[PDB]
Amino acid sequence: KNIIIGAMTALITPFKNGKVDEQSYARLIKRQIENGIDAVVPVGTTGESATLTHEEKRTCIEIAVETCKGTKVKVLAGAGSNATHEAVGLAKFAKEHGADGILSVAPYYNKPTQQGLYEHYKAIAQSVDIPVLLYNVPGRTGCEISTDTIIKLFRDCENIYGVKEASGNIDKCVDLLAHEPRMMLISGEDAINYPILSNGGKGVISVTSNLLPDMISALTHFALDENYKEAKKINDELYNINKILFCESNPIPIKTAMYLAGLIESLEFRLPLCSPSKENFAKIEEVMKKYKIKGF
Amino acid sequence: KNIIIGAMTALITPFKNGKVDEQSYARLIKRQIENGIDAVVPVGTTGESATLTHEEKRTCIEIAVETCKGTKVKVLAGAGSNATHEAVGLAKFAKEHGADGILSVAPYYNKPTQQGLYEHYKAIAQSVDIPVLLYNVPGRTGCEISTDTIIKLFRDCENIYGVKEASGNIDKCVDLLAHEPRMMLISGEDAINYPILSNGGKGVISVTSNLLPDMISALTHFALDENYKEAKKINDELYNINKILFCESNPIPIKTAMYLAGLIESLEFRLPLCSPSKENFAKIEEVMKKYKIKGF
Ligand SMILES: N[C@@H](Cc1c[nH]c[nH+]1)C(=O)O
Ligand SMILES: N[C@@H](Cc1c[nH]c[nH+]1)C(=O)O
Ligand SMILES: [Mg+2]
Ligand SMILES: [Mg+2]
Numbered sequence A, B: 001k002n003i004i005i006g007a008m009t010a011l012i013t014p015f016k017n018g019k020v021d022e023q024s025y026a027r028l029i030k031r032q033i034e035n036g037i038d039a040v041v042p043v044g045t046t047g048e049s050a051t052l053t054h055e056e057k058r059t060c061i062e063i064a065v066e067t068c069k070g071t072k073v074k075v076l077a078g079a080g081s082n083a084t085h086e087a088v089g090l091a092k093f094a095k096e097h098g099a100d101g102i103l104s105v106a107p108y109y110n111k112p113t114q115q116g117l118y119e120h121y122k123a124i125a126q127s128v129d130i131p132v133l134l135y136n137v138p139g140r141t142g143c144e145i146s147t148d149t150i151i152k153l154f155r156d157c158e159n160i161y162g163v164k165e166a167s168g169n170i171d172k173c174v175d176l177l178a179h180e181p182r183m184m185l186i187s188g189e190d191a192i193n194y195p196i197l198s199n200g201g202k203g204v205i206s207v208t209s210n211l212l213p214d215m216i217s218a219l220t221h222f223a224l225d226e227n228y229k230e231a232k233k234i235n236d237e238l239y240n241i242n243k244i245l246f247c248e249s250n251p252i253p254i255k256t257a258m259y260l261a262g263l264i265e266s267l268e269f270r271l272p273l274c275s276p277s278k279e280n281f282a283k284i285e286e287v288m289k290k291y292k293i294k295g296f
């Protein structure tokens, strides 16, 4: 299978006076490239996929693709939807605009059965010829892609090569790689990056790397080299910021941290997301103080 | 406040060869009207809102509006979204196409904060001049509209008149009506229709009424007339079917039952929804046996 693994960043989408700040977006991607990231995920959850227009999503993917041209960094475009015809459309769209692969979140809100998730992802995978990474996040979607469904999709569909797991369930991570050790398990939960990698996971799709790309890159590469002592040390150092970045729903804290670091011009979100409380603003600012944040 | 209350039906959307069966839709709505329903909800969750196109939603709303002309029955159109700009647009769309009010589900997947939910619904309510019913269903959305936020919205926004509660939490229902007894609490969970109504709730937005509209209307109207004994008796009779209609994610069981009863032509869903398991198919058919299902 063709794969996209390693240290990856779920990119924030900066807004300026209500519009995508395209220069800021390109600069942030260059900063990620220059700090050792192996792939960027435009218009994922952290990128406020739900509230971007088709035209804004096209712009973001094209900027990611153009900025990564001539480097080793891959573009793994968010393309999921809770309507299968839409998810197929978004997959084809991402491929046509140059993406190296797609991240495709489990349908949210309408709670399909396992049979339905199987047919959903089978349809998407048959629609394009680029790698497909499943994305399980039951706390946001209301459903879970079971281990058996993930394993059947990996075994039956040529482009489906693994899953980004954001379920806080290390037992599921064991179940997955004990029964299907050829899949790429990708951490979708920064606080437990090291435990997932040490069980044979092969990458992270990170929120914290927006702010500390160098640290998340090193963590992941140490771990892939089986320098587990060094990878755990970084994971442990990162725990406080990894947790504070979810004091409110992601990406509210990470955008706040990026703004406080001077990495984006404006602290703007698209409704229904909005600025954090004053208390959480101060807690994010305080936890940031112990970390060395890279500039441009 | 202008309100829409009483016995209401979350309409299934029948498909035939992948398209909305318009005739069937009109015929099902006339059947609801003839069996005492007070309002119909086109294109809600039970109507597979997530997977219908804009043209299909317009069609369903207009068929509902046209079928209710000349009757007391109101059209409370599903218009929610997890993007505030899209939810505002869908509310305007619903009003433009003849709806008497809108049902607006809490943003799913992106998990806004209470502050963001307040701003979300404030924008929607200021965009139209028709009643707005909030809709809380945390098991599908991943977030909860708190009691305090619901009460602030009801007090601050002229058009927001209550909430459809589908949270399986009668404590919340008490909390709401104990602190704000003027709002319209609407049951969004058939099995507990009578407990919600007996606590001062003023209607239901039902799944079961698709199949058994006479029994749900009678239940609701007995309760509103303070004939609690009669209302509870029908609630108790309905318990088995109210539960089996959630053996798989709604609307998979209700459409299956409608098909088994001959009320729709084809057991079709839009991916990612799909037919139930054979076992569940048999369970639904078995539970139906004790009930009298009205025809056309
Ligand atoms: N807001 C809807 C549709 C959409 C996605 N992106 C922009 N709009 C969703 O989250 O699925
Ligand atoms: N599927 C997306 C957008 C959509 C609604 N209906 C059709 N498409 C959602 O659930 O918000
Ligand atoms: Mg690598
Ligand atoms: Mg390359």
Ligand SMILES: [Mg+2]
Residues within 6 Å of the ligand: A138, A139, A140, A141, A142, A143, B138, B139, B140, B141, B142
């Ligand atoms: Mg949930």
Ligand SMILES: [Mg+2]
Residues within 6 Å of the ligand: A152, A156
């Ligand atoms: Mg198989």
Ligand SMILES: [Mg+2]
Residues within 6 Å of the ligand: A225
């Ligand atoms: Mg090495």
Ligand SMILES: [Mg+2]
Residues within 6 Å of the ligand: B197, B198, B199, B200
């Ligand atoms: Mg009472």
